[PDB]
Design a binder for these strands. Sequence first.
DNA 1: TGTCCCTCTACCTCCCT
DNA 2: AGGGAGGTAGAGGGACA
DNA 3: TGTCCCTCTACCTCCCT
DNA 4: AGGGAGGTAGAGGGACA
Lengths: 487, 489
Amino acid sequence: QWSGARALEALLTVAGELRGPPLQLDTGQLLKIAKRGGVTAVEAVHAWRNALTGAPLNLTPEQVVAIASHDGGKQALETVQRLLPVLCQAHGLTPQQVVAIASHDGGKQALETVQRLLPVLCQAHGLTPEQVVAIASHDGGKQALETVQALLPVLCQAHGLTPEQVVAIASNGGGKQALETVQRLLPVLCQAHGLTPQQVVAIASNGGGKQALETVQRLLPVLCQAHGLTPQQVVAIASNGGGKQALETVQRLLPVLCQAHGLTPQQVVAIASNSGGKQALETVQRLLPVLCQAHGLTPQQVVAIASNGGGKQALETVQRLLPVLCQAHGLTPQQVVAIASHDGGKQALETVQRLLPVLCQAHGLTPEQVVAIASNGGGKQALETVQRLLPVLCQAHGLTPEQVVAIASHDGGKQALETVQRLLPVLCQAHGLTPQQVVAIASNGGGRPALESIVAQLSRPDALTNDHLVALACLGGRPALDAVKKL
Amino acid sequence: QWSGARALEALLTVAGELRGPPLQLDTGQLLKIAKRGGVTAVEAVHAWRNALTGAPLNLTPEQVVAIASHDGGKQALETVQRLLPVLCQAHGLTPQQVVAIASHDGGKQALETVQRLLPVLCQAHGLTPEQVVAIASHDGGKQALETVQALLPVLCQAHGLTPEQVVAIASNGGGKQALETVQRLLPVLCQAHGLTPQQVVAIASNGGGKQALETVQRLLPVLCQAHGLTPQQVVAIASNGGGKQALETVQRLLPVLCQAHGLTPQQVVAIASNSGGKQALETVQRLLPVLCQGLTPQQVVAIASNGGGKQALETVQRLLPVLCQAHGLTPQQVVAIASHDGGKQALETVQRLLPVLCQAHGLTPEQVVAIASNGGGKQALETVQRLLPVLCQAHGLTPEQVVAIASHDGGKQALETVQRLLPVLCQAHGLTPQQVVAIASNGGGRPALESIVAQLSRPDPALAALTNDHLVALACLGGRPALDAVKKL
DNA sequence: TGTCCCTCTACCTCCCT
DNA sequence: AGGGAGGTAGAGGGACA
DNA sequence: TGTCCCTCTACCTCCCT
DNA sequence: AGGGAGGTAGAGGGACA
């Protein structure tokens, strides 16, 4: 038992012993933990399983896995056992919040720092607990929290930022570095022919952090003069994680991609202005000719695919799957492009390849309906949810397949479907809506909160007729309903 | 013999000729041009009168009077005939926009500068033509336009203002001075005194902005330490035309008013926080004991606490007795009429029109008082006199409905718009007269009606999911702003 | 003087909830 | 509907050709 | 090498026109 | 209907130890 067994041997032994309660974990979940937490975390999960799952902690297996699967995972598991009770009982944090803080590399450090600093940050006229939890819920959360403590005063007093803007900058991986760099570079960047303070805060708040701010300082003059970009365009490229990489790649590839009958600067900016913009741009360079020759695409289509986050993944997946999808599944290049042209296009394409037969045969949808569901951000999520909920929505709530498809065919389709499942009964039976009206409300981006907002208004109102509320919900969803409140 | 006699005689001669076609100007119009544009303006109107009135320009006589009635009016008249076509074709401006630009001292300079700078302001600076027209449409518009061109970058970048805030500052007489002063004083007022950029923009965003900004810098310390005013109260006093005068008068009279009459600092600040705040404060000091020896202190404060405070106080002193005696009003009613911007105008108009509205139109004194008891009450009262017969006889409204439309700020505008749009909303789109009256019976009645007519006349996609009844409920709830927000969906 | 620009006061209308 | 904001008219001073 | 921190990439949902 | 904004999970690697 106690022994000098090798690393894999130790891992597999623990795996053997984790087949059952309270912590039943498959090799997959064990792989997830091990990639980051290592065999160390797996052994820690094994050692502490009963206390983690038992009272007063009451963590689900899902929460335990989430804490364990990070660098230092063993340390975070030990620390949550000690500090969760403390943070919840003495500071009124929820377990969800504590788990959120714990589930990042170095979670031990973040938890101990929230314990130490929450009392000083949340004094009168200070931060809310929610803001502290948000800052802490990233890798290096300890560093970000200590740096907010230090620099909140100078950033607000000397540089004129609001505490909310400071929290926004701090609430990213490498937040400490972003805060220190804003402090240093604000005066430099914000001069005539420079940036606005708003643009500096945006770059510092959007993921790209210190590196993006430093690269804009470095490259703004040459990008805006020799390369002819606007400061707005430069800020758009800078305002994602990896902004530095996209900026440098634009510098290098603008001369290459914008020659006669190539791309325009505006096309290049659109490709670069997403997370992974460097990868998207390099992949466009590599694959534009071959996608156009081999699969009959046009440059405009290639650019369209590339102009979303994960553009590299979508282009490579089009290269790989367009033939399979057209030949075996009967889709057209246009339909394949349509599915590919959203964030997560790779995920949607692979899910269409996998689920299209099942959806057309067993559930009776047409390929066109499947394409329609797939052709939105999170298309994979919406396709899988249609597969899951179509029969129950049609049988128990009496919807038609066409109505289910309409609910699903928008960004957040998964959320809207699940919310229709939840709320259709109360909306119809308690407030006299028809399923038609519920479907109409749900059949837009932001379908979920539109439904939630209308159920809430119909339950405890602050007028406007119910049909008028429904029309507003359809027109503008939750934001429409909230606009009416302020009237 | 007197030197100015030849010019005056020249003036009266040409003036007589302008009473004929194609302008048929009246006495008031002629005095106005002579007073503000001088003899060169009156002569210019005569010389250009044919070129301006018909094809191509087709300006109305009142438009010609608007352009002529400013220093350099002669210059502006010449420039408008020359540049109006160039600005309507080269930049897509309307004639009404060109006339608005021309209708200020130095309108020539503004027109020429709009011609020269509009492209660069809209292209390189991102401003819209509407924003350029607004900046241009003040005395010294040329200076404001040039300064916006020169300073928009440094103000947005080095000072963190939005382009909208810069336009707001520029869109006042003396815009150039306000912009240059904001550039210099923004860091000082924010960092030394804790003001937000928003507050500084608000101080700068009035006529005499520069003066108010420099006075806040000078007096903020003294006012907040000695007198116990807060930065917010100082900003509030500063945030009007003549802000400087108001602030300096507050320093002088705060203690005097508080000791001798027992006002609080709160009441003093309220009196000071209008256009003419200086005059209001000084008048409260000399008149309060006179009024109260009678009215209560609290009533005097209420009257004083609106723009034109001095005028209303003085008018109440003069008319309080004759209105209560001859016209059977109470002191509380006279105070109510007086306690709005333009109180003096409303009081004098009540004195003139109460007997007429009562006898000729069958209104009650209470209805007359209700119409008068809003800002622009004079205008609403005069419009009721004019339009009550046509609204009732031609459009089927009851006197009660007409009084309801009239009894809000902008009542004149609402009444005229109802007269104008009632038939189209009812006959063409099937609104009931009661629905039209409901939309009109709020502040902003006019624009709410126009927004509603706009939708049902050229059906915009956004407003389509909303039925006429829903649109009516929205228009009544939040007027043009609500309708406009819906359009944005 | 004629013109341009700036400041102050009074008055009117619409907005924001 | 109550305080707040945004706008136009009118008049006078400084400045200067 | 485990722990911590930072940087970069990919994916999902909702908002705003 | 087509971007814009904001949120998350996950991979890789440097520093340190």
